[PDB]
Curated annotation (Swiss-Prot), chains A, B:
Pathway: Carbohydrate biosynthesis; gluconeogenesis; Carbohydrate degradation; glycolysis; D-glyceraldehyde 3-phosphate from glycerone phosphate: step 1/1. GO terms for biological process: gluconeogenesis; glyceraldehyde-3-phosphate biosynthetic process; glycerol catabolic process; glycolytic process. Changing F94A: 2-fold decrease in substrate affinity. Its EC number is 5.3.1.1. D-glyceraldehyde 3-phosphate binds at N8, K10, G169, L228, G230, N231. This is Triosephosphate isomerase. GO terms for cellular component: cytosol.
């Protein structure tokens, strides 16, 4: 399957810092028909970023509404995103589940809205440190995936992201062994509930303190198809992470 | 006085599990001149642990011999510990008094040997459930402390640990009120036998099923200066217990 590398800039950037960063990104020579590279800038930065980035790079937004067009002040609907030809959306990111009270119900409704409007979605899930120490990792992960897996119709348009909460922006990356185990179990869940062909074509990425030093060993794992990169994507060295996947 | 938090790994660990654990511990940003944090790995794990742990963490061993260098197969003398620059030693832990037949006499001789070799010691004592139900708590505790208190010359180098036997690894922690009462009586014993200045500078920790949920309320007590943590110290969440003391 095609490897996938996503840059989640989260809530960072200025018009100038983005110009400098996109410049470095554009210098990397890579074939978009062999590797997917998506950049997710802040909403108000979308037009600026899409313009500066070369067409080989795909772009998207960090969140989308579970509602349609209407009286929902502050939200961006899937219909609006499609009108702008925004290709991807991130759904269920830990930070939205944590600081904001997004639940599995919100995740499934947002995915349904996205697929309905032909948007490609990057869906995140993962267990907290407390759940891991209680050995509930697989139980929690299974519940989270089952909350929306039946909605997936085209397995090339939905990308799964295993995000252990304890590894997000902390510097404590999951070891290749740890991640591989979880990814293998996730694909088995998909295989058994959706089908083997489907399971083998869906990308399952790892997210959580991925950097230029550990990316190579992680992507080498049989069931890790790429990554969702946070803080490391705000640096010019991010290009080396992309290189590890080509 | 400076709070003190001790991680007693007891008889647990593998080279790999220690690498993962020390990694999480190293991520906690804390000032060692404001808080003492000591880790006690198994003897054969000492070098490995000392190397992996950052210098902000102090280390020690779980037991020391009451004899000096010589024909005592299986023992580690205080002289040997000092040669290795091992900073702390635990003395009189319930498990050594119980499974092994260490008595108050052994506790005092081991402390004398430790202080003689400039080692800092964490001395444990506490009453059994049977003694508590007979209302002999203070009587038993007083006898145990009096067995070695005259040997203390530097009150910053000896740390006392009130370990109610019924609270060790059982999950039944002493309530803040219970512990506070006992700690207050212990400090009064020291005050009256050694002096007020001495009594006010010596750390008296509580040990017995301390976890991330109850640590805050315990450390808040006026005479509880920290803890000796067992099972909860084998988990990455141990960092939250350290946080409660900073």
């Amino acid at each position: 399957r095609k490897y996938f590398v996503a840059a989640n800039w989260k809530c960072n950037g200025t018009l100038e810092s983005i110009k400098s960063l996109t410049n470095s990104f554009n210098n990397l020579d890579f074939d978009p028909s062999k590797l997917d590279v998506v950049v997710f800038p802040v909403s108000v930065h979308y037009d600026h970023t899409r313009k500066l980035l070369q067409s080989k790079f795909s772009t998207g937004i960090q969140n989308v509404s579970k509602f349609g067009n209407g009286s929902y002040t502050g939200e961006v609907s899937a219909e609006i995103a499609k009108d702008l030809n925004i290709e991807y959306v991130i759904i269920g990111h830990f930070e939205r589940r944590k600081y904001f009270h997004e639940t599995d119900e919100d995740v499934r409704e947002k995915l349904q809205a996205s697929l309905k409007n032909n948007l490609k979605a990057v869906v995140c899930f993962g267990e907290s440190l407390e759940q891991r120490e209680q050995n509930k990792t697989i139980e929690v992960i299974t519940k989270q995936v089952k909350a929306f897996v039946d909605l997936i119709d085209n397995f090339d348009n939905v990308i799964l992201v295993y995000e252990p909460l304890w590894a997000i922006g902390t510097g404590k990356t999951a070891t290749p062994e740890q991640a591989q185990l979880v990814h293998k179990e996730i694909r088995k869940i998909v295989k058994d509930t959706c089908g083997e062909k489907q399971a083998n074509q869906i990308r399952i990425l790892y997210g959580g303190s991925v950097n230029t030093e550990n990316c190579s060993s992680l992507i080498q794992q049989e069931d890790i198809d790429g990554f969702l990169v946070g803080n490391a994507s705000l640096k010019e060295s991010f290009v080396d992470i992309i290189k590890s996947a080509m």
